[PDB]
Amino acid sequence: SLGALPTAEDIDAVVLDFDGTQTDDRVLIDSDGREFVSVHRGDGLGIAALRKSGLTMLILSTEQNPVVAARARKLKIPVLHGIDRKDLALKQWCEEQGIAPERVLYVGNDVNDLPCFALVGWPVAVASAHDVVRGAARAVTTVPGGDGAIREIASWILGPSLD
Amino acid sequence: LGALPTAEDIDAVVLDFDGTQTDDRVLIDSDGREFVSVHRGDGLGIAALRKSGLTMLILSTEQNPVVAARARKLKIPVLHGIDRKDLALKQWCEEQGIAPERVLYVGNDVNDLPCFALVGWPVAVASAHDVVRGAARAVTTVPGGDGAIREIASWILGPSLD
Amino acid sequence: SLGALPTAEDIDAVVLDFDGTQTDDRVLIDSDGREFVSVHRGDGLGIAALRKSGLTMLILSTEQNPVVAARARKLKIPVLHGIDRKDLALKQWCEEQGIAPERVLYVGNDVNDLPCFALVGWPVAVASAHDVVRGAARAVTTVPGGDGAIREIASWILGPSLD
Amino acid sequence: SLGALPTAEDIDAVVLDFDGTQTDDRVLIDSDGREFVSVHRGDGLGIAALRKSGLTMLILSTEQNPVVAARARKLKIPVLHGIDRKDLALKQWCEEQGIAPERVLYVGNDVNDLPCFALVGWPVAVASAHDVVRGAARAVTTVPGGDGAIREIASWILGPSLD
Amino acid sequence: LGALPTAEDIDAVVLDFDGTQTDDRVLIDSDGREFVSVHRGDGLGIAALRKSGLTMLILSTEQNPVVAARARKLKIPVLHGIDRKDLALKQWCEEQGIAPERVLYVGNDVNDLPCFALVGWPVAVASAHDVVRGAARAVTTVPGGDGAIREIASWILGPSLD
Amino acid sequence: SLGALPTAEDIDAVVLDFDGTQTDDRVLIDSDGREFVSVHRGDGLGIAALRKSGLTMLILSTEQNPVVAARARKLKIPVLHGIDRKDLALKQWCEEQGIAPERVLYVGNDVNDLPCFALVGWPVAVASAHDVVRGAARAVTTVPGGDGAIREIASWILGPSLDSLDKEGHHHHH
Amino acid sequence: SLGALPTAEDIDAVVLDFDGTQTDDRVLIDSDGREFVSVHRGDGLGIAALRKSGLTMLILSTEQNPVVAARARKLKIPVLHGIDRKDLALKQWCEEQGIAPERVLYVGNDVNDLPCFALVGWPVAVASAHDVVRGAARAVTTVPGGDGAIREIASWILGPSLDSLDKEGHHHHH
Amino acid sequence: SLGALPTAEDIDAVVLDFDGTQTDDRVLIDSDGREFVSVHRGDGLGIAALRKSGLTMLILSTEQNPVVAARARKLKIPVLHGIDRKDLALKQWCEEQGIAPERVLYVGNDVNDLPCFALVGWPVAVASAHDVVRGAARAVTTVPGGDGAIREIASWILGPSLD
Ligand SMILES: [Ca+2]
Ligand SMILES: [Ca+2]
Ligand SMILES: [Ca+2]
Ligand SMILES: [Ca+2]
Numbered sequence A, C, D, H: 001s002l003g004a005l006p007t008a009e010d011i012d013a014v015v016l017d018f019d020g021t022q023t024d025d026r027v028l029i030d031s032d033g034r035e036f037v038s039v040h041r042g043d044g045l046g047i048a049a050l051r052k053s054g055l056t057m058l059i060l061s062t063e064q065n066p067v068v069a070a071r072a073r074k075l076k077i078p079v080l081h082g083i084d085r086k087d088l089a090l091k092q093w094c095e096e097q098g099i100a101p102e103r104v105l106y107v108g109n110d111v112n113d114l115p116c117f118a119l120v121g122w123p124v125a126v127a128s129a130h131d132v133v134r135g136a137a138r139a140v141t142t143v144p145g146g147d148g149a150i151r152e153i154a155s156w157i158l159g160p161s162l163d
Numbered sequence B, E: 001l002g003a004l005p006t007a008e009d010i011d012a013v014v015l016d017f018d019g020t021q022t023d024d025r026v027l028i029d030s031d032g033r034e035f036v037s038v039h040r041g042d043g044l045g046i047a048a049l050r051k052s053g054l055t056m057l058i059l060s061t062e063q064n065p066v067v068a069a070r071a072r073k074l075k076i077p078v079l080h081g082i083d084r085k086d087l088a089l090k091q092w093c094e095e096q097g098i099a100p101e102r103v104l105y106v107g108n109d110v111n112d113l114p115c116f117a118l119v120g121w122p123v124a125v126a127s128a129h130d131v132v133r134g135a136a137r138a139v140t141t142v143p144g145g146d147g148a149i150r151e152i153a154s155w156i157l158g159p160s161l162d
Numbered sequence F, G: 001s002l003g004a005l006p007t008a009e010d011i012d013a014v015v016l017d018f019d020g021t022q023t024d025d026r027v028l029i030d031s032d033g034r035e036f037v038s039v040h041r042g043d044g045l046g047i048a049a050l051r052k053s054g055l056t057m058l059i060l061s062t063e064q065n066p067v068v069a070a071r072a073r074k075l076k077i078p079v080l081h082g083i084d085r086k087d088l089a090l091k092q093w094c095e096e097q098g099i100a101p102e103r104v105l106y107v108g109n110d111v112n113d114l115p116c117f118a119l120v121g122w123p124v125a126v127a128s129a130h131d132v133v134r135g136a137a138r139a140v141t142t143v144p145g146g147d148g149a150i151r152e153i154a155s156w157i158l159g160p161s162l163d164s165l166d167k168e169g170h171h172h173h174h
């Protein structure tokens, strides 16, 4: 029915934007160009649970800085980053695995996520997403990016105990 | 996909009342008389949208004592005390010669979802029930009662409403 | 399970404080002392869903408050107001309904609710409750009094669909 | 100096919008269409101080609004309401007072104030004003409409002591 | 120095009205009839303080149409429509046999400063004028109209008001 | 007295969870995977005040991340971390210290704290705790984790001056 | 049209202040005096979108702190910083680029931006700007510095999709 | 008069607490014990102006970590830190210079500032100060610690332009 949240039976894969989706879009920088971002332990918990349930996972980012890959390492899920066209990378990634895009949940926050949203069955915007992104999503989290939005999504799929 | 509605996309604006033009609160006295708060910014936006030639309607399930008074002030028709808003909307569209695809409908709660399904441009206020926020084609940044309709008016008519 | 939210299986009755619980604790007054309060349509929906589900309902208020009686009539649930002691009135009411207090959910916000909290199995504080009351509760809403706290509780019992 | 706040030396008149400027833009309504609005005691104090200081005062509102006239009486300042065009009424009012529009401070919040802003030397937006209005102003309050924005402006003119 | 007032420090609690027990807003109708919002938590706190035996008073400069009605509900005396609150307070202290040093006075604005000077325990609400916040001996964390008196009651009587 | 806040007479020990309790549950990470967390100076002052009052202190954590020990070092309080089962570690520690679990205050924020909550007399949830944890607690702070929740608890136990000053406002030695 | 927001037709250049405009005006400092600042990825996307649209870009700053250049490097836009007089540097730069100051958008937050504001056609204050700066501006963002104020400005100029997608929602190449 | 803010003629010295007064009381830490804090550029501006006006300045802290001294170096003002008793250090500091404590402005936020407050003529609390500290101050800033509270204080002493 219209507006229904995704369930475990609806999806085979979870693809996550990084900055602004797993973070609050802020980046700490030094004079050398080193970057730091804040991630949320609740998201860690949610991602670990989704991973353990057998879902195919990906972090997808246009950002070249290795900080995204450092987070991906901690979470033990694949990362594709420094990609010019997010949507083309996503299309190719689905086709390499024979995954139906209709059974992909993709989480984003800004306008460079919109072409990905159009490709997949379950586009999800974090609460802090920009206007047109919030609208284009099939579901919207109540928790903002960097505050545990991915844990909230994990609870939709796996239930409140994250079983 | 990443597009707010524009004046070229729509011929009608249909508005829920409680929780969309209000914050979903009702002030009550000892007799059970009811009062609600509306927003003057919404009034300004509604007047600009009406002046631009858009066909407008307020649609509500409440025997709302006050919605007819508000409609009268805004100089737009009202249909209220209806258990099937979607059928009322469909009937109104037919009577007005307006295609549902060209209707912007603004709501906040689960009883708006059947209306959302019928129209081209379902819009949720920021304070909408979680499922309604997702179901909408666009979502306002300001909540019901705080000028959500005023914000929609600027999407359609520009920041100066001109 | 420690901290578990109540479900339909756990409760036979829902008893509600009024000011601060179904309202933000404010009262509009005129020169003659006439009182007006703000209630929430979402609470109205949640209360109707709980009533429709067959739960025995009650509003309890210490002072004779004609505004509470007006609200109760609208909600189609009984009210006991103008009573010496909320907790004793509640105890008598349970004994008469044949209802185990262990299966009563009572919602409150301030220290005058503590004797009721001690009597029932499922004391619930609204988010805006005072410190000691938040602690004394078995569950605490995320939504404050007058903002839809009762609708939240209704969602615990009946699901986010309210059925 | 670019961006300087107005002082007593700069202005001969203070003209005030009502809804959204002296209020939070909300209107309480009943079934008969009777209207009620909330005004701020701090604004009352600020307005009395400006009036006492000898400044020529006026409230301007497009619609015939009996509530605005009640407020104006309390404040002991005149009101022009039920007028075709705010800006033309203002222009005529200035011409009659003998006051240079360059030395008029006008406070507003929405796009219907822009013609007035264009006419006067000191257009002032309340903090809660809409984007284009905040920009169009010569000064912007930090306090929103209905929260004491007029008292803030009175403090610019007379000091935080209001004298 | 770093001490909130306790029951042993005071014999009286004197309360300003607008902006202290209210958010300083007034609702008006077309006739100029005035309505204000008070707080039930404040009511509970005031009742506990009164029950503990503290001598209490509301003091206001407003011909406030509604302050006498509120005082009547709270079962405490009121003095209002007074241009010199400080002299009213001094007179009341003399009549009550209460030493000003043992009075907790709660206010929010510059017209409270002369009262602040007379008493041992001047308290500003969080939303007080900037100078009044500094002038006070203690400052509440909650603003006027939001339960500032309820918060003071817990300083004097403990979190459970017992 | 239902809902009463803990006082100095009620407790002999204060045991603290770390992430989400002394922090906002976020981690700052750099290009190379180094982790940083934000703690609060108010918490630090509260913890030192509790320690000076003679309460037995402890930070308890599940994870290997050495940042917790670094915080514990600065605070001069012991750590029990990298632990398989948190609650068992706590039960054993209580036994070994000769402290009755009924007189232990434990502060936490997440569902993995619930077994510790069940063990102790005074479970306390930070304002930002998971919904079920706020309910399960005997007391709930108003201030969230990383924002001075432990400083708030310290004021429940020691009063508004953290026992640094007496009534008349003079410096407390001891 | 009084108060109108800038559009693509109004401007040929976008010049940005740094601290307080692309940041929240705070600096993170460590035990050894190293300085860090927080910038915003939304601003980064907005800036790149403006640059791709053919607007001449520039970051202008008074201070020697090299962090600004590091940001400018990542954004692929020139820096003019460590400058004695900001406004003179800007007037000269406009002249040298063949850009009329009336078609320059300058974003700032503090009183030292007022002379630049006077120079240009489209001075813009971030929401968090000093009170006099908010007044002096021709437009004021709703979002504060460091929170995506430049991303907001980018949406004024390019629309809600930042010109990455057309009406019908297809990818814009050019 | 009661509650009056300090002026330039009232004071000869400004002594500043660090954590929570020039910061928001947060500290970023690594596994090695390195600390980072966030300071505000507005405070930098205000402190530079107070320094240039000829006031004797000090940053005073019980914190042993060198981060406080790094900030003091950037601001070019003396620091005394790692001090056991803040109040005793302050008393000694005043006496070494023959400064009257009545003409000292001291800014703080927490209970370890109270004995310093009692020593000086002009104790000032930042807006975010703890309850008893806000009360004990002679003046309270409107801006919280780490948000430009010292700039606000500088404006009291030197005027809005910080001349
Ligand atoms: Ca992103
Ligand atoms: Ca509705
Ligand atoms: Ca949608
Ligand atoms: Ca209540």
Ligand SMILES: [Ca+2]
Binding pocket: C134, C135, C136, C137, C138, C139, F134, F135, F136, F137, F138, F139
């Ligand atoms: Ca509990």
Ligand SMILES: [Ca+2]
Binding pocket: D017, D018, D019, D020, D021, D108, D109, D110
């Ligand atoms: Ca207006």
Ligand SMILES: [Ca+2]
Binding pocket: D134, D135, D136, D137, D138, D139, G134, G135, G136, G137, G138, G139
């Ligand atoms: Ca301007």
Ligand SMILES: [Ca+2]
Binding pocket: E016, E017, E018, E019, E020, E107, E108, E109
């Ligand atoms: Ca008052």
Ligand SMILES: [Ca+2]
Binding pocket: E133, E134, E135, E136, E137, E138, H134, H135, H136, H137, H138, H139
């Ligand atoms: Ca004081």
Ligand SMILES: [Ca+2]
Binding pocket: F017, F018, F019, F020, F021, F108, F109, F110
């Ligand atoms: Ca934790």
Ligand SMILES: [Ca+2]
Binding pocket: G017, G018, G019, G020, G021, G108, G109, G110
């Ligand atoms: Ca700057």
Ligand SMILES: [Ca+2]
Binding pocket: H017, H018, H019, H020, H021, H108, H109, H110
């Ligand atoms: Ca400090």
Ligand SMILES: [Cl-]
Binding pocket: A040, A041, A042, A043, A044, A045
């Ligand atoms: Cl994690």
Ligand SMILES: [Cl-]
Binding pocket: B039, B040, B041, B042, B043, B044
């Ligand atoms: Cl209206």
Ligand SMILES: [Cl-]
Binding pocket: C040, C041, C042, C043, C044, C045
């Ligand atoms: Cl209802």
Ligand SMILES: [Cl-]
Binding pocket: D040, D041, D042, D043, D044, D045
């Ligand atoms: Cl008034």
Ligand SMILES: [Cl-]
Binding pocket: E039, E040, E041, E042, E043, E044
């Ligand atoms: Cl009451």
Ligand SMILES: [Cl-]
Binding pocket: F040, F041, F042, F043, F044, F045
């Ligand atoms: Cl610390």
Ligand SMILES: [Cl-]
Binding pocket: G040, G041, G042, G043, G044, G045
């Ligand atoms: Cl970026």
Ligand SMILES: [Cl-]
Binding pocket: H040, H041, H042, H043, H044, H045
């Ligand atoms: Cl600085």
